Amino acid sequence: GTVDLDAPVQKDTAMSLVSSFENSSTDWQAQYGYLEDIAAGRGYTGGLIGFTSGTGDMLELVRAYSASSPGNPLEQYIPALEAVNGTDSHAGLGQGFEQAWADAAETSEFRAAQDAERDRVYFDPAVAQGKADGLSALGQFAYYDTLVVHGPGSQRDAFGGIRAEALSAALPPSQGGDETEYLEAFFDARNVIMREEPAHADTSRIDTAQRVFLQNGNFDLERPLTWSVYGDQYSLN
Ligand SMILES: N[C@@H]1[C@@H](O)[C@H](O[C@@H]2O[C@H](CO)[C@@H](O[C@@H]3O[C@H](CO)[C@@H](O)[C@H](O)[C@H]3N)[C@H](O)[C@H]2N)[C@@H](CO)O[C@H]1O
Numbered sequence: 594g595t596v597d598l599d600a601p602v603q604k605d606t607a608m609s610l611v612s613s614f615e616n617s618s619t620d621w622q623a624q625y626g627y628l629e630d631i632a633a634g635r636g637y638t639g640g641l642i643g644f645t646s647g648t649g650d651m652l653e654l655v656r657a658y659s660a661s662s663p664g665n666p667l668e669q670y671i672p673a674l675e676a677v678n679g680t681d682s683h684a685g686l687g688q689g690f691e692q693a694w695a696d697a698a699e700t701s702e703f704r705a706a707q708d709a710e711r712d713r714v715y716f717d718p719a720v721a722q723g724k725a726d727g728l729s730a731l732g733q734f735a736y737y738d739t740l741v742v743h744g745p746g747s748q749r750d751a752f753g754g755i756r757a758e759a760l761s762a763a764l765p766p767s768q769g770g771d772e773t774e775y776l777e778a779f780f781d782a783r784n785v786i787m788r789e790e791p792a793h794a795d796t797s798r799i800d801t802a803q804r805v806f807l808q809n810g811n812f813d814l815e816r817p818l819t820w821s822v823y824g825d826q827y828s829l830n
């Protein structure tokens with residue numbers, strides 16, 4: 594490879610790939626207002642990368658939004674988000690919270706808060722670890738999508754654990770290993786974890802997208818790209 598995932602065109606391409614996986618649309622800027630309980634046990638899932646009320650990151654996002662934009666319509670729901678954190682309960686939230694999310698998503702400031710939380714927790718750590726492992730943009734993207742779905746952490750079902758399992762099977766480029774063999778190992782490790790949860794059992798984001806880019810040798814993740822997820826085809830010129 595020759596460019597990292599954080600280059601401006603590659604980053605935009607990354608956001609469109611993840612929106613195709615999360616919302617079945619390459620129009621990633623239409624997804625800041627997404628808010629749904631997809632009934633997989635995480636409560637509400639919201640925004641560009643599926644921040645959730647069950648796992649702490651929706652809370653972190655709304656707190657940061659409230660620091661940067663006092664009095665916004667989500668701030669009053671901070672106590673409820675604190676209370677349901679760690680559970681999939683909607684208690685204290687409901688239609689008023691769903692409407693306040695919709696309202697906040699029309700503003701620059703909420704969109705900026707989502708961008709910041711995405712970059713601090715998920716995207717910039719994927720890029721930094723990819724580069725430390727000697728990976729191309731496509732490798733960096735493999736790490737980013739893993740962080741989006743599985744989150745950070747060293748547990749076997751989080752990004753750090755998936756990466757540890759890959760490293761046990763294949764050396765990364767930074768240690769002399771071949772990138773293709775490393776990413777095939779990484780995708781194999783990730784698919785094991787995906788298949789352990791019924792909501793993640795469909796691995797097409799890997800098998801008919803990421804693996805395709807690797808097969809094509811598209812290490813810089815350059816356009817034009819074509820891929821499928823959930824049996825639907827997508828293209829980015
Ligand atoms: N065109 C539909 C096709 O969209 C659909 O597939 C479903 O699409 C959903 C939106 O992308 C997707 O939901 C996301 O799932 C991920 C994986 O858990 C979550 O992280 C997101 O929060 C969800 N929004 C479904 O998983 C996916 N099955 C399909 C119906 O099955 O039919 C086509 O006609």
Ligand SMILES: N[C@@H]1[C@@H](O)[C@H](O[C@@H]2O[C@H](CO)[C@@H](O)[C@H](O)[C@H]2N)[C@@H](CO)O[C@H]1O
Pocket residue numbers: 635642643644645648649650714741742743744745746750751
């Ligand atoms: N958006 C969630 C994401 O939060 C979650 O991953 C967890 O994130 C926690 C806080 O960021 C972290 O402490 C924990 O170790 C992660 N596994 C994943 C997986 O539950 O789901 C995403 O939808």
